[PDB]
Amino acid sequence: PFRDCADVYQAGFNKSGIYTIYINNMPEPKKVFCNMDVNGGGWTVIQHREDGSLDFQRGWKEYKMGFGNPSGEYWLGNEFIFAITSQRQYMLRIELMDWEGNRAYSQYDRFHIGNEKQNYRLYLKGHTGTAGKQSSLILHGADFSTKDADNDNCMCKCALMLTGGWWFDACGPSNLNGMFYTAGQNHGKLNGIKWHYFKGPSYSLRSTTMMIRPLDF
Numbered sequence: 001p002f003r004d005c006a007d008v009y010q011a012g013f014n015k016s017g018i019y020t021i022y023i024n025n026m027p028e029p030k031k032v033f034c035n036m037d038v039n040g041g042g043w044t045v046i047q048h049r050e051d052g053s054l055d056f057q058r059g060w061k062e063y064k065m066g067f068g069n070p071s072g073e074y075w076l077g078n079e080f081i082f083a084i085t086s087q088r089q090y091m092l093r094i095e096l097m098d099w100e101g102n103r104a105y106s107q108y109d110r111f112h113i114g115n116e117k118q119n120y121r122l123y124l125k126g127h128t129g130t131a132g133k134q135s136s137l138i139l140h141g142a143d144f145s146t147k148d149a150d151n152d153n154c155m156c157k158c159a160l161m162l163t164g165g166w167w168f169d170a171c172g173p174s175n176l177n178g179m180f181y182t183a184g185q186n187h188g189k190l191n192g193i194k195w196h197y198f199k200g201p202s203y204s205l206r207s208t209t210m211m212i213r214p215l216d217f
């Protein structure tokens with residue numbers, strides 16, 4: 001029973017696309033995009049953005065259950081992210097592109113997130129890549145927050161200032177779920193789709209993909 005796109009790959013489907021996966025302890029299947037091209041393939045996409053067609057200003061429940069479509073932009077849903085990352089040890093890669101043709105990535109040796117009663121707190125270790133030398137996600141641990149669930153480390157409400165659902169600190173150095181600003185708009189925006197150690201706190205990115213695979217791939 002395919003638990004993730006790593007399984008899908010090892011069974012010989014080497015072509016990127018929509019696949020269905022059967023996550024342990026989850027009542028129903030789930031479609032995901034599998035990227036089979038990137039490291040040596042194997043990647044379950046957990047979020048993707050590229051055109052702004054999908055709105056990321058959603059509440060806790062939509063963040064939990066997922067929204068959008070794996071043929072385009074989407075958020076896989078926290079409950080599923082937790083569930084997949086409970087099945088084994090996963091690593092996380094984050095593909096990013098700016099408006100001038102540049103591609104960069106961040107990678108994490110180890111990723112998982114807590115369950116809902118842990119506010120889906122992020123845990124990460126082992127940052128490398130070309131999207132900056134420091135990690136733009138906090139490594140040390142942050143809750144997940146959205147407009148209706150204020151779980152950040154700030155006295156202010158970060159999801160309200162920056163939009164979207166994210167592991168905000170006192171809003172920290174990233175928000176890949178902010179507002180999508182188009183070509184030539186990407187400049188001077190404070191609540192865009194940002195990764196501070198790549199392009200900075202006021203650049204809005206052209207495109208993001210967050211994906212996971214097991215260490216033993």
Ligand SMILES: [Ca+2]
Nearest residue numbers: 154155156157
């Ligand atoms: Ca707060």
